[PDB]
Amino acid sequence: LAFFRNMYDKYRDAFLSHLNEYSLEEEIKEHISKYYKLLFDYNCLGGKNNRGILVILIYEYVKNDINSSEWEKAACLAWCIEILQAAFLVADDIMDKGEMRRNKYCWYLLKDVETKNAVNDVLLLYNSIYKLIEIYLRNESCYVDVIATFRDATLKTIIGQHLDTNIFSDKYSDAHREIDVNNINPEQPVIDINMINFGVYKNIVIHKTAYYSFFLPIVCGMLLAGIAVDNLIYKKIEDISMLMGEYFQIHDDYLDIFSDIQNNKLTWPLIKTFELCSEPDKIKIVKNYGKNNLACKVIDSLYQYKIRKHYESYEKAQKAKILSAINELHHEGIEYVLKYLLEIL
Amino acid sequence: AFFRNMYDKYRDAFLSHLNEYSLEEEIKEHISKYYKLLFDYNCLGGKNNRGILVILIYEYVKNDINSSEWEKAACLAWCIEILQAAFLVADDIMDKGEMRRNKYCWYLLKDVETKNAVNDVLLLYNSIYKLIEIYLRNESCYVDVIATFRDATLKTIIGQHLDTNIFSDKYSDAREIDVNNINVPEQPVIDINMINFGVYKNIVIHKTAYYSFFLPIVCGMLLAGIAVDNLIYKKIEDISMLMGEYFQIHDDYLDIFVGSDIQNNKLTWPLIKTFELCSEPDKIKIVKNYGKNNLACVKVIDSLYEQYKIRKHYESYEKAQKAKILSAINELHHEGIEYVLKYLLEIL
Numbered sequence A: 001l002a003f004f005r006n007m008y009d010k011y012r013d014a015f016l017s018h019l020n021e022y023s024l025e026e027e028i029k030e031h032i033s034k035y036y037k038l039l040f041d042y043n044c045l046g047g048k049n050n051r052g053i054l055v056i057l058i059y060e061y062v063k064n065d066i067n068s069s070e071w072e073k074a075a076c077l078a079w080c081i082e083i084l085q086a087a088f089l090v091a092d093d094i095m096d097k098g099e100m101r102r103n104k105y106c107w108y109l110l111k112d113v114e115t116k117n118a119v120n121d122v123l124l125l126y127n128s129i130y131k132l133i134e135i136y137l138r139n140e141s142c143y144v145d146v147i148a149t150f151r152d153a154t155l156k157t158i159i160g161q162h163l164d165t166n167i168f169s170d171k172y173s174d175a176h177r178e179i180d181v182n183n184i185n186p187e188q189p190v191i192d193i194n195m196i197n198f199g200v201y202k203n204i205v206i207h208k209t210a211y212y213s214f215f216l217p218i219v220c221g222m223l224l225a226g227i228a229v230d231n232l233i234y235k236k237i238e239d240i241s242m243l244m245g246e247y248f249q250i251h252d253d254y255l256d257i258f259s260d261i262q263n264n265k266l267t268w269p270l271i272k273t274f275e276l277c278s279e280p281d282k283i284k285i286v287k288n289y290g291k292n293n294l295a296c297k298v299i300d301s302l303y304q305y306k307i308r309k310h311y312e313s314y315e316k317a318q319k320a321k322i323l324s325a326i327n328e329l330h331h332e333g334i335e336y337v338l339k340y341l342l343e344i345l
Numbered sequence B: 001a002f003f004r005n006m007y008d009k010y011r012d013a014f015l016s017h018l019n020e021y022s023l024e025e026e027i028k029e030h031i032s033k034y035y036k037l038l039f040d041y042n043c044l045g046g047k048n049n050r051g052i053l054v055i056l057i058y059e060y061v062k063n064d065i066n067s068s069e070w071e072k073a074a075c076l077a078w079c080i081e082i083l084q085a086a087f088l089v090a091d092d093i094m095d096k097g098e099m100r101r102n103k104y105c106w107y108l109l110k111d112v113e114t115k116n117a118v119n120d121v122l123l124l125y126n127s128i129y130k131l132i133e134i135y136l137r138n139e140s141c142y143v144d145v146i147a148t149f150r151d152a153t154l155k156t157i158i159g160q161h162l163d164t165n166i167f168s169d170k171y172s173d174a175r176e177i178d179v180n181n182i183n184v185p186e187q188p189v190i191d192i193n194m195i196n197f198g199v200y201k202n203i204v205i206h207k208t209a210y211y212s213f214f215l216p217i218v219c220g221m222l223l224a225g226i227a228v229d230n231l232i233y234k235k236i237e238d239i240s241m242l243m244g245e246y247f248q249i250h251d252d253y254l255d256i257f258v259g260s261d262i263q264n265n266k267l268t269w270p271l272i273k274t275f276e277l278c279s280e281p282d283k284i285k286i287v288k289n290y291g292k293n294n295l296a297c298v299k300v301i302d303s304l305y306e307q308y309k310i311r312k313h314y315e316s317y318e319k320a321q322k323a324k325i326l327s328a329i330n331e332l333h334h335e336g337i338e339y340v341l342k343y344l345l346e347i348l
Helices: A002-006 A008-020 A026-044 A050-062 A068-095 A114-137 A143-166 A198-224 A233-256 A268-276 A279-288 A298-302 A307-326 A332-343 B002-019 B025-043 B049-062 B067-094 B113-136 B142-165 B197-223 B232-256 B269-277 B280-289 B295-307 B310-330 B335-347
Strands: none
Touching (some): A002 A008, A008 B142, A026 A114, A026 B142, A068 B113, A114 B113, A307 A332, B002 B049, B025 B113, B049 B335, B067 B197
């Protein structure tokens, strides 16, 4: 863990050195190094690093001691998921028109950066991952499996982000109406009652968060430690990641309200309200939800149906469900790490 | 024509991958409709010069080709056209474009907006690696093919970054980036110290040469069996740099002969050539009129391009650069590749 935080500079510098190998004039090399050193520092640091620490701990409790060479490969993957998290946060802040991230200005808002640089910076941060995995793991037998884990988890995350963005959009509500390529007119957003259910929510939440925040770090630690791809434990870990991803997102929905409502987002409190509330309360929800004004707050006042109390009842049930799955892994090491992660989160 | 017929096979193979995700049937219907359009709207309508270059390089290094081998070649060829589609979607968001291939830019569509378009660039980009996996995971060249895509993309991103910020205040004096300014916008101004051919070549080689020339040729060569450590790859890289510079200078020339490079404050070949041969008072005119979203400002630059005979200077450059490319092609010592590169140089 201590080594993981300390090794940050090494991975950032190993990538910056690859850019410094390019055929460019010395003055231009200096300019890109100063910009890209800040792109990595401003967006990769200041975080809790739970995804990164998960790789370290999984690798440590699977391994059967660990030298500096093996730890360098484990810490590389741990920092690659932190880079992936940074690439997703920069992209998410552009998309959801964010104002603050890790208690400071969103990267894309900076006048030396702007939307034009931030879009290009998401692809840079994303591609740096595969360059870093090549630098430190290209000769490991697990190399192709590791890069496929990053690629497949990213694809599922992109689909999860798409669904989160367009679940209440006109193309999803008016299913029979094909997309009009001639219409270039900020389309007024409204809530869709057909999508306000727990089934649709799980679909989004698992794809948007579970694969890159839970499945990818655990699989990274397991692949590097030598657990064969065909082993039964990987599917068990996939199902646990889904349960944890759902648990983590419902907690994050609970922490954002009691910009979620303002951005017309499908949240666990919104679904729970609709499940217990009657028809006049439903009309009120449709009328207020998805507006940038503080008066439209009626939704916050309705959240009346004791949603905060319902969450405490959900959290108890969900934790027991995750523990039930963990207890059947038949691996003491992974079981200790996952139980530890479930508390300290 | 044979390559354009293969399109559906690769688009559907990736759409089928997304369809195997654990999602509700109605959710699967919506994403398949959106993503079929994401691919169709942005991957078709192009000249496909990058894709055809894979096919011809593969065909002439191989010297007949069976359907299974050509299925692998056409996959890589379509992957570069998907990479082109991803870069054009992103560039239009970045440069705030209006039209691409005679139709509205993807990010401007009511059912898309900037939010979806940003996410769609990452999807199109990652679809390339899923397609390479589906058709080449068991090939010996697999890892080298995916490293080639990754490295050509990394060089394209750096090139696009330089193209975007070469004249920006953070680079005008080497100082520290302002992490506190989110309100006072930067006034777009030219940096005469960056107006030179050496800086231009750095931008253009990274922005265009690697993904438009090096990547397609290396794809055809790797799949045909020329191992990554072969000395001929550095020769291909040098030729790709010359061809990339040659074609971007032509693109810069075409933008003036619509075209927004002047109003967008871009470092172009006409600007460098004008700055090289113009008078000291005309350099003052350039500084005052270049990169301004005003018609009268653009018209002063346009008149300077006519006054300083940029058409004649391009025609003279084209003849000298063509001779330089042919000379590099002749020192390749591979008849099949030489033929393709000589053919593509005339046809493109």
